């Protein structure tokens, strides 16, 4: 039912990398998907540009706050994914790069 442009519900970690490293996508291209790791958790996948590897995809676990909430680092939590994505879009604040455009398909 009408997901966000960056929400790829059932996309695996491997295809997330494959999709983000594909043409049309660039630095800061990202998506959020169900985590391969934990119950009801989600993971952030982001394409980043470095010196040695060139184009690469970095994956972050998005933790759940008991009874509601999300955070990547304990020093700043968010009531929802929209808040989390807006936050990291305007500031990397610890992340590898600022979130730019959702993965384009």
């Amino acid at each position: 039912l009408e997901p966000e442009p960056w929400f790829f519900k059932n996309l695996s970690r491997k295809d997330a990398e494959r999709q983000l490293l594909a043409p049309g996508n660039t630095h800061g291209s990202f998506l959020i998907r169900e985590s391969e790791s934990t119950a009801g958790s989600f993971s952030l996948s982001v394409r980043d540009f470095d010196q040695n590897q060139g184009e690469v995809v970095k994956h972050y676990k998005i933790r759940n706050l008991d009874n509601g909430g999300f955070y990547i680092s304990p020093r700043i939590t968010f009531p929802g994914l929209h808040e989390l994505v807006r936050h990291y879009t305007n500031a990397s604040d610890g992340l590898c790069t600022r979130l730019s455009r959702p993965c384009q398909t």
Binding site: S37, K58, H59, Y60, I72, S73, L95
Partner: peptide, 4 residues
Amino acid sequence: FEEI
């Protein structure tokens, strides 16, 4: 998994 990358971390902040």
